[PDB]
Structures are given as C-alpha cells and as structure tokens.
Amino acid sequence: KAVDPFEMVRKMGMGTNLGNTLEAPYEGSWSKSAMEYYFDDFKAAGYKNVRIPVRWDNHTMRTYPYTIDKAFLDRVEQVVDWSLSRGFVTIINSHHDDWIKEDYNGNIERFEKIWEQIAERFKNKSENLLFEIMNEPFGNITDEQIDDMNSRILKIIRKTNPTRIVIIGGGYWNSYNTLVNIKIPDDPYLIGTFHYYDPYEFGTWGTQEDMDTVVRVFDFVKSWSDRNNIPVYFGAFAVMAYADRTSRVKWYDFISDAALERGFACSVWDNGVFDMAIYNRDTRTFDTEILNALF
Ligand SMILES: O[C@@H]1[C@@H](O)[C@H](O[C@@H]2CO[C@@H](O)[C@H](O)[C@H]2O)OC[C@H]1O
Numbered sequence: 001k002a003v004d005p006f007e008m009v010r011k012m013g014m015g016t017n018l019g020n021t022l023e024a025p026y027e028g029s030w031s032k033s034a035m036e037y038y039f040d041d042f043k044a045a046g047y048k049n050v051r052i053p054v055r056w057d058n059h060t061m062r063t064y065p066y067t068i069d070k071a072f073l074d075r076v077e078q079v080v081d082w083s084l085s086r087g088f089v090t091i092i093n094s095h096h097d098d099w100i101k102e103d104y105n106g107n108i109e110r111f112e113k114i115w116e117q118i119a120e121r122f123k124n125k126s127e128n129l130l131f132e133i134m135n136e137p138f139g140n141i142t143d144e145q146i147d148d149m150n151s152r153i154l155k156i157i158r159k160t161n162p163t164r165i166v167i168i169g170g171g172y173w174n175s176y177n178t179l180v181n182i183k184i185p186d187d188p189y190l191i192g193t194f195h196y197y198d199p200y201e202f203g204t205w206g207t208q209e210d211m212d213t214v215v216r217v218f219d220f221v222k223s224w225s226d227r228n229n230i231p232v233y234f235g236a237f238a239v240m241a242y243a244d245r246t247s248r249v250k251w252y253d254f255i256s257d258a259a260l261e262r263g264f265a266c267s268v269w270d271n272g273v274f275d276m277a278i279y280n281r282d283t284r285t286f287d288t289e290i291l292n293a294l295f
Helices: 005-012 036-045 070-085 104-121 143-160 208-228 245-261 288-294
Strands: 014-017 049-052 089-092 129-132 166-173 178-180 190-196 232-237 265-268
Touching: 005 089, 005 190, 005 232, 005 265, 036 070, 049 070, 049 265, 070 089, 070 104, 104 143, 143 166, 166 208, 166 232, 178 208, 190 208, 208 232, 208 245, 232 245, 245 265, 245 288
Parallel strands: 014 049, 014 265, 049 089, 089 129, 129 166, 166 190, 190 232, 232 265
Antiparallel strands: 166 178
C-alpha cells in the first residue's frame, strides 16, 4: 500500500514549470538558474506542484557506461529537495534529450543507464517526487518504440522504486485531432500526460473556437482517463502566442478551470523570460493577473 495516482493528482492541483533551467544545454545558459527562494515564492503564490525539466545529455558520458556527472546529480538533488521540503509534488524527467529519438536502437541503452542512475539516486525520496520518463515522447519515433521505451524505463525504475508514481505520455492533441494510448503498461502507479502536438508544423490563439476545441479534447481525454482508470496530467499548458494581453489572461483562466473541473492535474509553462513567463526571477514578483486566473 502506497499513495495511488488518483490521490496524487488531486494533491498536485495547479502547479508551475521551472522552465528553461535544468533542461537548457547547461544550467544558466538560458534562463536564470535555480535558486532556493524560487520555491518560497512559488509556495507563497499557491502552486501545489513543480515540474523540473532536465536535459541529461551534457552531464552524462557519451560512451559506455554513460555515467552521469556526480556533480550534476548532486545539483538536481539539491533542487529537488528544495521543492520537496516545501511540500510541492515535484516532477523530474528527461527533457530535450532528443539524441534518443535520432537513433532509438543506438541510444536506448544510454537512456536506460541514465534512468538507472536517476532511479537509484532518488529511490528514497518522498512519494511526492514523481518520475516522468520523457517530456514529449510523440514525434520522430515510432509508436512501437515509444511503447518499448516506457516498458523498459518503467521496469528499470521499479527495481529500486516499487511504488513511486511514474508519468508516461497518454497522448496529445492539436486543433484537428486527439490521440490517446491504448497500450498502457500494467502498473498501479501511473499517471498519463498530454501535451499539444502537431505533426505538421511545416492565426494566434485565444479565440472562441479554440476554447471549444480544448473542451472537446479535455472531454475525450477525460473519457480515456475514466476508461483506463488512469489520472491525467497536463504538464505544460499555455505554450502559445496570444493576440493580446486580455486574451492571454482569459486563456489561463479558461484552461485551468476546465482541467481542474475534470479532475486533471496540471503545471503551467513558465520559461522565466521577460516570452511566456509568469514569475520574474530577478524581481521575485509574479504577473498577479495571471496567478489569479489560475486560482
Ligand atoms: O525559449 C524557448 C522555450 O520556451 C522552449 O520551451 C518549449 C515550449 O513548449 C513546451 O511544450 C516545451 O516543453 C518547452 O521546452 O524551448 C526552447 C527555448 O529556446
């Protein structure tokens, strides 16, 4: 007996991303690196969870045995503990580690070793630390390889983390269609996550129709959720350009109302740039209007 996915999702509520930080090529190379006070402010702001993207590529050896720099693991643990110590449901993953998609067969072992070491190093963390296998799994990889990856990375995790909730891609959506996974691993500690995906990238968001599209997507995902008995998590919503200020505020308010109503847990995307940012890391102030739209 441990905490179950549905209980975890209800607990996660609305949260935030620590974007363009640990998933940049090197911490700091993009947005300001992680500072402990970030978490004090997130807490004071109402966030109930913090997703922490991480790109392991440049901190892991490029050749066998694919060891992760101890120094980097220490760094991620420091940031995780700041989050966990403040009561946040904390999520860590693999983000922008595209090398794995560029050659699945050739790089899957390095990906396993990476996950092997992560699971090991955090095996004793609170139940509130969740393992998200890979940020946006859909794309330049086959549906079979995606399924193979989840099964094997999940199996690695389970050896040292028997009951820790793992997050895997449940599907994605766009203005034309929604895709959901039918092939779900047989595990009692999984949460499904969906992101906006468009296989044909080759307007501006915020309209009426756009909202009708999302409510549609959300209802289908919800049906998926009830049918497969698996909670839902929108790990990075509101990653779009809007026609104007008033439209942006409206979208955050809408999206979060619709998700929380259907019992979905979610994290807003915040790249810390002042440009899809809600929290200013230099002034330690939030875009109050948006924060109120989320809660
Ligand atoms: O500044 C850019 C970031 O905003 C960008 O972050 C992507 C935004 O969409 C989300 O779905 C992705 O997860 C997130 O990585 O990355 C590139 C950077 O230059």
